[PDB]
Amino acid sequence: AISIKTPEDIEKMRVAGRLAAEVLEMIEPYVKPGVSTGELDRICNDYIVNEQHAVSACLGYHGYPKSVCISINEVVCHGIPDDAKLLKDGDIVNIDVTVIKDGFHGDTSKMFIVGKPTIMGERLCRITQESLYLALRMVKPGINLREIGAAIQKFVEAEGFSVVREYCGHGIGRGFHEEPQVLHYDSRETNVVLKPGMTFTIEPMVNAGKKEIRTMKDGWTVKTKDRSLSAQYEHTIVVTDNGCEILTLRKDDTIPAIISHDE
Numbered sequence: 001a002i003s004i005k006t007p008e009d010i011e012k013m014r015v016a017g018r019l020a021a022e023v024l025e026m027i028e029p030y031v032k033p034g035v036s037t038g039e040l041d042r043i044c045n046d047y048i049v050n051e052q053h054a055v056s057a058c059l060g061y062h063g064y065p066k067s068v069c070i071s072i073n074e075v076v077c078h079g080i081p082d083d084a085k086l087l088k089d090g091d092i093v094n095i096d097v098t099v100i101k102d103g104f105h106g107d108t109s110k111m112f113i114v115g116k117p118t119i120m121g122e123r124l125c126r127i128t129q130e131s132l133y134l135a136l137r138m139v140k141p142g143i144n145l146r147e148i149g150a151a152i153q154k155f156v157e158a159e160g161f162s163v164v165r166e167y168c169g170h171g172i173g174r175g176f177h178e179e180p181q182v183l184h185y186d187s188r189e190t191n192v193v194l195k196p197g198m199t200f201t202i203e204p205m206v207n208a209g210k211k212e213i214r215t216m217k218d219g220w221t222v223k224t225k226d227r228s229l230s231a232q233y234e235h236t237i238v239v240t241d242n243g244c245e246i247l248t249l250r251k252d253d254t255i256p257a258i259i260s261h262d263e
């Protein structure tokens with residue numbers, strides 16, 4: 001039950017994906033020691049609504065109270081922007097943006113290293129991004145999603161890191177989360193052969209320590225059980241006749257938007 005997007009639908013997803021990437025490009029100069037995550041979220045929401053003329057997909061979703069998710073250090077995902085939570089030197093911070101424009105969603109996230117980097121935070125982020133890139137290079141018609149999950153997990157584990165099991169990438173379109181599930185690890189339950197026109201995300205969450213996670217009493221914030229650092233990067237893509245096209249590419253990405261496997 002995976003929708004195949006029309007050329008028209010794909011163009012709408014290009015528009016929405018560009019907007020989502022542009023929020024991440026816009027916010028970058030504000031991501032500095034001393035800024036609050038609450039302030040970052042307000043800046044993002046104002047940009048999305050007032051400049052992009054779009055809406056945040058997260059706001060109100062299952063009751064989520066903010067417009068973006070901002071996850072620092074051992075927070076794995078779903079970190080809630082807060083006026084009292086200040087960024088500081090050495091922090092690694094995920095900002096995850098999902099916008100709806102003209103009925104279609106764009107979904108992307110990246111890590112920011114705040115101020116003076118720690119070497120371990122830098123390495124975790126780099127390996128996490130590399131694991132996303134490796135997976136993007138695999139996407140083409142006929143490949144199984146299982147092969148991609150397996151490859152992400154092998155790469156990450158060889159570095160002494162772990163992949164979070166509880167969360168996955170997803171189909172995306174008129175809905176935020178559509179079929180298929182995109183596991184970032186090997187499972188016998190995964191059997192999805194890719195076809196041109198499918199649109200989905202890849203979004204591995206990678207912990208420096210052990211894979212186990214925990215939800216806080218606020219009902220939202222997820223942390224590593226061992227309090228190790230965690231990192232995530234996310235792109236939305238469309239499968240093409242010969243590979244894929246990344247819909248949420250930024251200028252700071254170092255992988256081509258259009259990946260072709262033809263001669």
Ligand SMILES: N=C1N=NC(N)=C1/N=N/c1ccc(F)cc1
Nearest residue numbers: 058061062064069096097098107
């Ligand atoms: N699956 C996701 N990809 N990017 C995001 N921001 C995602 N999910 N966010 C949420 C997931 C569950 C929820 F209740 C509220 C938000």
Ligand SMILES: [Co+2]
Nearest residue numbers: 096107108234
């Ligand atoms: Co996202």
Ligand SMILES: [Co+2]
Nearest residue numbers: 107201203234
């Ligand atoms: Co997503």
Ligand code: NA
Nearest residue numbers: 072073075230
């Ligand atoms: Na994190």
